[PDB]
Amino acid sequence: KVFGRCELAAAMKRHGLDNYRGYSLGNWVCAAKFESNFNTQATNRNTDGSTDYGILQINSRWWCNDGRTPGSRNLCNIPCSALLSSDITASVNCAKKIVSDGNGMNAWVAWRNRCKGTDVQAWIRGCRL
Ligand SMILES: [Cl-]
Ligand SMILES: [Cl-]
Ligand SMILES: [Cl-]
Ligand SMILES: [Cl-]
Ligand SMILES: [Cl-]
Ligand code: NA
Numbered sequence: 859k860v861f862g863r864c865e866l867a868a869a870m871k872r873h874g875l876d877n878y879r880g881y882s883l884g885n886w887v888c889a890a891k892f893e894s895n896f897n898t899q900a901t902n903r904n905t906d907g908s909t910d911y912g913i914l915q916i917n918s919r920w921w922c923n924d925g926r927t928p929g930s931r932n933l934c935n936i937p938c939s940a941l942l943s944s945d946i947t948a949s950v951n952c953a954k955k956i957v958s959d960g961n962g963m964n965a966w967v968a969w970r971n972r973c974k975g976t977d978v979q980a981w982i983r984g985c986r987l
Contacts, residue, residue: 864985912941
């Protein structure tokens with residue numbers, strides 16, 4: 859599924875992410891956009907045999923189990939496949955654990971390169987929230 863911006867703002871808001879660890883909402887939506895283009899189904903292979911999955915491009919190295927990442931913690935205790943679903947619960951529930959792990963949203967390279975320090979509010983402008 860290929861989210862609306864305002865639409866996705868509302869679901870993440872819904873599932874507890876607005877202000878989660880002081881990361882306001884526009885961050886989450888900004889991260890989402892440059893990581894996956896708002897597409898539940900993005901997968902991108904990493905040079906270290908690992909794969910990034912779903913809206914937030916979550917890593918199979920530490921967070922999910924995808925069955926082909928020889929070295930792998932499954933810290934979110936979930937198959938990577940469920941991060942590609944159209945319901946973002948799994949994707950949201952895993953990212954709360956990432957943002958808490960003692961690096962915050964710098965865990966999302968795109969967030970760090972594309973959202974950090976910007977007017978992240980502009981990504982919820984006009985959205986009925
Ligand atoms: Cl915001
Ligand atoms: Cl995508
Ligand atoms: Cl997803
Ligand atoms: Cl990665
Ligand atoms: Cl922080
Ligand atoms: Na694993």
